[model samples]
Target: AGRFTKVAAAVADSVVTIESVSDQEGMQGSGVIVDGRGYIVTNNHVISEAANNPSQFKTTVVFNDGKEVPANLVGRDPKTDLAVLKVDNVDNLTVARLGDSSKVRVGDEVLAVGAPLGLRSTVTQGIVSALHRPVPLSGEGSDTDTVIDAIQTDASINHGNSGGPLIDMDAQVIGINTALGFAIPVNEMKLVANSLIKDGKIVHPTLGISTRSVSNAIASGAQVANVKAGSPAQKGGILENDVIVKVGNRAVADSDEFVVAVRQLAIGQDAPIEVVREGRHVTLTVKPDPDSTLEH
Candidate 1:
C-alpha cells in the first residue's frame, strides 16, 4: 500500500496469468473484476485454441498472490473475440470500471496492463491512434472471418497481451487487448460480453446483403460479393457482383459503413435495401435476421 504503487495495484493482484496447456505456453492478459462473485472478462482468442481442443489445451488462471485456480470457459464470442470465465469459490473480488469507448478520442493517453511473454503485471503507456479500425482475423485451417473493429494504440502489445485491457487514466477499460497491433474496442467488448453472458454468444442482425467496401474508384456504389443462399438477399432477387448505390434513402458508402448500418437494424424487421448488380441498380425489401456467426 505504498504511494509509489501504481493505480492499478488495487486490482492487479486479481489480474491473473492465462495459460494454455494446448499450446503449452503462458502469457499475461488483463481481466476486470466484473463482480464480487469471481467473474472475469478476457479475449476469446486467448482461450479459443484450448477451448477448441480442451483435450489438447488446458487453460488456467493464476493469481498474483500465487493462487492458481482452474478456470472454466463460461462463454466466448469470436465475432467480437471476447470471452468470460469464472473462478471457483472466489468472492469479494474487485471489479474494474468500464469506460465508454464512444467517448474515447484520438491522442487520448491510455495504459495497457498485461503480462507480455510471461512478464506478469507489466504496464505500458500509449495513445489512441485510431478508432473503428477494421482488423480481420483469419486462419488457413479456418475459413471463418472475424471482424473486430479495433481501437488502434501505440502501446507495445505482444503475444501475451491478448485479452488484456487498454485502460484510461481513470482505470477504466477503453478497449480489450486482442491483437497486438490493434486492440478490440470496449464498445464491441460490451456488445460481445453482454451477449456472452446472455446467450453464451454475441448475435448480430444481418441485412441479408453481401456488399464490399467502396474504394476511391467508386463514390456511390459498393460491390456485391456473395449473397447468402435462401437469405433475404437471395429471396429478394439480389445477385452476386452487384453494386449497391443506396440503402433505405441513405447514401451508400464503403463496405464497412454498410455493415454498421445493416447491423443497426432489428431482426425480422423489413427495410428497403438498394443494390446495383452488373451496373444495373435494383431495390429490394429485405428482412434482417440473426446471424449466428457474430460471436463477441
Candidate 2:
C-alpha cells in the first residue's frame, strides 16, 4: 500500500503477471483476475506470439502470492486486442469489479497496476488524460488491425504493462492498459470479456464502415475511407470519403468517437446516422448487424 493505501490494499490480490514465451521470443505482461473461478483478462498481444506457435510456446500466470500456474487461452479477439485465460485450482483469487467506463471523465484520478518490465504488482498513479483516443495496433491495412478507442491517462505504462488493469478511485477496474498509457474502455472490455467467458468468442456487432479521424485535414468528423460491400454502412447510405458526424442521437466528432458510437448500437436495430457528403449534411437510418466475418 502506498499513497492510496486502502484502495491499493483492496485490489492487491487481483493483480497477476503474464508470461508468454516461445522458443525464440518471450513477453512479460500483467493481468487482472476477473472471476473467482480463475478467469483473467489480459492483452491478446501478450499471448499472441506464443498462441500462434503452439509447439514453441508456453503461457503461465504468476499470482501475487508467488503461486505460478499454467493458463489456458479461453478466448482472444485481436480486433479489440483483448484476450482471456483461465487457470485451475487457484485459491484465494480476488476478482476486480469492472466499473462504468462511459461515466469516466477527463482529469479523473487513476492508478495503473501492473508488472512493468517484470516488476510485479507495481502501482503508478495519474489522471485520465483523454477519452476515445484512437491508438491503432500493429496490423495496419488488414481488417484484423485493432483500433482500441482508449481511455488516455498520464500514468506510467511500460513494456510489460500491457493487459494490466487501470483502477479508479472507487477501486473499480476502468480500463486495460494497452500502450502509450491508453487503456481500452471498461465498457468495451466488459462486453468482450463477458462474451469470452460465456461463449468463448467475441459477440460484438459491426457497422462495416472504415474512417479516418478529423484530427487530420480530412473533415470536421470521421471521414469515411471505405464501406464494405453490401455491409450496413453502405446499405444505410454511407459512401466513400463521407464524414460521419452522428450515430443514433450521439454526436461523433472524430474517428474514435465514431468507432465507439457504432459499437454501442444494437444489431439489426435501426438508428439515425449522419454524414457529411460533399459539404452537405445527410442523415440516414441504418441497421447494424453481427459481423462474424469482421471481428467487431
Candidate 3:
C-alpha cells in the first residue's frame, strides 16, 4: 500500500488536466510534463478541436495544486496521435522520466495516471496485458488510416484519460495513455515528439506494403499480405505471402521490426530486402516513394 502510494505521489505533479475549449463546446483530457521548460506532451486528439479552429479555441493546463495556465499548441502529429504544448511564464515544473518501452514485458506492473471523467490526478494499477497491439485510427484531416502499435493494459482509461502517462513500477513513463486505454510506447512517441518539436510535422518514406506477423510455435517473421499496385513493393516484385526476413542488414523478426526498419531508411535509396518464399531465400532492391506521406 505504501509503495503504491509513493509511486502515485511521485508522478502526480507531473501529470496535469487539460481543458480544450472550442467555439462549439469544450473537451477535457490529460497531459504529462516531458520537459521543465513549460513543454508538455498530450494526445493530438485531446487538443485537435482547438487545432481545428485555432482562432476560436483555447487550451489550459491545470496542475495538481489547482494552478491553471493558458497554453499554446507547439505542434501536433495526427499520424501518431501525439501533440506538444507550450506554456509561457511557468517555471520549475516537474518532468516525468521516460523509460524504454522495448524493455517492458507482459505481466510487468504499471500504473495509468490521468484525469478520467474529469477527475484529476487519478491513478489506476494494472499489469502489461499485451504489447505491440496495433490500434488503427483515422488520421487527422486526412482519410488515410494510421496505426499505433500500443501497450494494452487493463487499467481503467476513460475519455479524459487521453494523453496521460503510463508509468512503470520504477515511476518512469513507458507509454502515453490513448483511446480505449491503449498507450503508445514511449519509444514511438519520442520519435514523433522530437520531430513535432523541431519541424511541427513528420515525413517518411513508404513501402506501400501491408504486412502481418507470421508466427508459429517456434519462430516469427513479417509476411506481406498485400502490396499496393504500382507501389515500390509491387514494382520491386514483392509478392503475397512472402515473408520478410530482413530489411537491409537488419533482421526482420516481426511486422513491428519491419515497420521500424523501413521507417529508418532514406527516401529514394534502394533498400535490400531479403524474403523467404517457397522455402527459399530471395533478395529484392526496392526504392521507397518519397512523396508517400506516412502519418504514424
Candidate 4:
C-alpha cells in the first residue's frame, strides 16, 4: 500500500459517522473510536443540540462496515468543545491510537479522516500550519465563551468533519478536528476527556478577572478590566486598574499569557498573583474557583 493508502487503512475503520437528531433538524458529524468498549470522541457542538434534550434528540453512530447503533451521551465540556459517547454491545472494534499532540511541529505532514457531508470514510491530507493558535467559540452565555489554544492545519476539514481524527504518518490520532481544520491538541484533549468520562464535565479553576494587553515603551503586562463581584479575584485583593505582572513565578506579557498560566494551575491550589498597583508591586494569594471561564 502507498503512504496515503496505508494511512487510510489504519484509521478508516476507527472513524465513524455521527448524527444528532432533534425535533427541528438533524446534524451530521464524525467521530473516532477511542476505546474498544465503544467510547467515541467528537466535537461537543456535534452533539450539543441532542445533548441539550436527550429525550427530544437522538444520537446515532454508524461504522464504516454499515453497522448502525444508538449512542448514549457520556458527557460534554463546552469550554473545550469536546464530547464523549458510548454504544452498547460492541465487540472487536478498532480503536485509534492517540498520540502526543505536544510533539507535533510546524510543517509536519498529517491527514484528517472523517465523514464530510455524510460521505463515509473521507481522507484529506495537509501540514500543520501553526501551533497555539487561539480561536474563540461562543458559549451558552457571554461569560461562558472560551478561547481554545488550537492547532491550525491545512487539512481540508469541512462540514460534518467535526470530531474526526487528525492523524500523523504513524496513523496515531494527534487531535480532534474542529472548525476550519483547527484541533484541540490531544495532550489537552486527553486530560479533558478523562475528566469528562469520569465527572461528566471539566471543573477547571479560574482567577475570576478579565484583562487586556498593555504594551508600552516602558512596561507591558495584563491590565485588569473587570473582576466578578465576590469572586476569587475580589477576595484575593485583586482590584480594578491593577496590572498583573506575573502568575505565580512566571512573567506574563498579555491576557493570553496570563490565561494560559491560570489554566495550567491545579484547581484549589494557591498561586501568587503579582500586580503593579499605584507605584509599587504587590502580590496577592488567590485560590481559584471552578466554573469561571477565562475570556479575552
Candidate 5:
C-alpha cells in the first residue's frame, strides 16, 4: 500500500545477489549497485571466506528478475570487512544514490532491502535504533570492530542482508546493510564505505596503545595503560601510569578522546600531545610510525 510497492520496486532494481563460498561454508547476501556498467558493493564476510582460497568456491550474482551472472572480485578490505564485485559483460546497471550516513540520526525511518533466506528482493522497515555502534559483523570469528559505527535497526535483517543498502525514505543509501544494524554504529560503516571506495580498503592509524577515558578519580592525572612494548608512546617518553590529560590542540578529556585524537593523525605525522601527570602538564612532540600489518 501507499508508496511501499514503488519503493520496493526501486530497491529490487538496485539489489543484487552476492554468492560466496569457503572451504566448508557456503552462503549468500545481497549487494547494492554502486556504479554503472557493473559494479556492486557487499560485505567482505559475504565473499571473503574465499580469501586465500578463492579457488575453493565459485561466485555469482543473481538479479531481481532472476537473471544470473558471474561476478569477479574487484578487491576486499579486511579492516572494514567489505568487498567490491564486478559483473561480467554487463552495463547500464541501476545504481543506488549514496546518502550521507553522518546525517542519519536516531528515529530516522529506513529500509533494508536484500535477499534473505533466498527470498529475492525482500525489504524490511525500521528506524535508526542507535548510532556509533562498533562490533564485528564479518562472519562468526570476525575480530572486534569488524563493522564500525554502524546503524542499528530492528528491520529483521538476517543472513542475506549483509551488503544491501540501508536506504532512507527517499531511497538514498545512508549506510551499507551490515551487522543486523546492531552493536555497531552506522557512522563507522560510513567511514568504512568511504575508505573502501578511496583506498580500495580501510586504512587506520596505529599508536600501539590501548587507552581508556579519564574518569573523575583520574582527573588530577591522566595515565595511559596497556602500552605495547617499543611503540610510539613508549619511545616518545610516555611512561606507564603517567596521566595524560591532553593531546595536541585538544584536551585529553578522557581515554576515548585519545582514540579520536590519534586517529586524526596521518601516518608518520608529527604532533605534540599534552597529558597531566601528578597535576603537572607536559607536552611531547612525536612522529607516528606506520604498521603495514594493520588490517585494511
Candidate 6:
C-alpha cells in the first residue's frame, strides 16, 4: 500500500510534461523518459498538431524538477497513436524499466504518473482492470478505424496523462497511458516505439482482406468479404469466401480477434492462416506486408 509512494517517487524524474510551444496551436500532454540518452514516448495526438507545422510549432519537455528543454519529434505513427521525442542528453535523467507486459495480471497493482501542467506531477493508484481490450481510434478524414489492443485500467488517465507510463508493482512500465483509463500494453508500445526510435516512423503489418466476424454465423471464424488485389491475403491465395479460423496459431473469435491476431504477425514473416472455404479446410501461409494504406 505505502510502497506506491516509494515507486512513484523513484520514477518521478522519468515522467515529463509535453507542451506545444506554439501560439498557432495549443497542446499539452504528458510523456515518459524511456531512455537516458533522451528518448521519450508519448501519444501521437498530443503533438500531432504541432508536428504538422514544423515552423509554426515547437515541442518542449519539462522535467519533474522543472528543467525545460527543447525536444525533437523523432517520429510519429497515427495508426498506433504513439510518438517518440528526443532531447539533448541532460543531467540526472532517469530511465524507466519497461517490463514484460505479457506477464501482467489483471489484479496487478499499477501506478500511472504524469506532469499535468509542465510544473506539477501527479500519480494515481489502481489495478489492471482488463487485458487484450480493444479501443477503436480513427484518424482525421478516414473511412476506417484503427483498433488498439490495449490494457484497461482504472488509473485515472486524464487530459495530460497521454503517453505517461503505467508502472507495475516492480516499478517497471507495463503500459503507456492513453486518454482513456486504458493503456497501450508496454509490449505493443515497445514494438511500436522501436520503429519510431530506430526507423523514425511507425510501420503496421497488413492482412489485406476485408472481413467480418462470423458473428452472424461463422462456420466459426472471420469471413472474408473481399480480398484486396495484390494484398498479402490475395497473394497468399485467400479467397473472398474463405473463413479464417486461425492466424499464427491464434484462434480468432471475431473480426476484432482477427485484427489483433493479424497485428501480432511480424511484417514480412510467413505465418500460417487456417481457413474454411465452402466447408473445406485450407491452410495458407501469408507473409504480411508493411501497410502504407492508412494515414499515419
Which number leads on TM-score? 4
Q: TM-score winner between 1 and 4, please give it.
A: 4
Model 5 compared with the native: what TM-score? Answer: 0.77
In terms of lDDT, the poorest run of 10 residues in model 5 is 140-149
The local distance difference test score of each candidate is 0.68, 0.81, 0.82, 0.83, 0.67, 0.81
Any runs in candidate 6 off by more than 4 Å, and if so which?
116-122, 140-144, 216-220, 292-296
Better structure of 1 and 6 per lDDT: 6
Candidate 3 segments exceeding 4 Å error:
116-122, 140-144, 209-231, 238-268, 274-282, 291-296
Error of 3 at 265 (Å): 4.2
List where candidate 1 sits over 4 angstroms from the true fold. Answer: 1-5, 8-11, 22-30, 116-122, 139-143, 207-221, 245-253, 256-261, 277-283, 293-296
Q: What is the C-alpha lDDT profile of model 3 across 95-186, one tens digit per residue? A: 89988999999999888888533554467788899897766666544324466668999887666566889988799999998763689899
* Predicted candidate 1 versus true structure: per-residue lDDT over 1-296, tens digit per residue: 63314655654654567776644554345555565667778877677666766677667777666667778877876656678887888755656677899999999887777742255446667889988776666521232455656788888765555667787877777887765357877777777677676776666777566677665543455677888877877886777777776655565566755655565566776778787655555677877768775542
lDDT tens string, model 6, 1-296?
Answer: 47988888777777888988777556788898888899999988788777777788888898877788999999987766788999996977888888999999888899988874454446788998989886766653222356778898877877656678899988898888877388888888888888788878766788888788785453777889899998888888998878888999788777777877887788888999999888788899999998764523
Mind giving the per-residue lDDT tens digits that candidate 2 earns over 168-210? 9999999998854888898888888898988788756688888
Compose the digit string of candidate 5's lDDT tens values, residues 1-296.
66655676676778888776656777688887877768788777677655556678778898877788988777766655667787978766778777777787889887787753355446778888877554434343343343243468878666656678777888787777765454223355545556565666556666777665456754632457777887888778776666667666666555544655665577777778676666666787666766555543
The global Cα lDDT (0 to 1) of model 5 is 0.67
Model 3 residue 194 CA deviation (Å) reads 1.9
Q: Identify the candidate with maximal lDDT.
A: 4
RMSD of 3: 4.1
User: How far in Å is the alpha carbon of 59 misplaced in model 5?
Assistant: 2.1
Q: Could you tell me the C-alpha RMSD of candidate 6 in Å?
A: 3.3
For residue 60, what is the lDDT in candidate 6?
89
- Which of 1 and 5 is ahead in lDDT? 1
Q: How many residue pairs collide in each prediction?
A: 11, 0, 0, 0, 23, 0
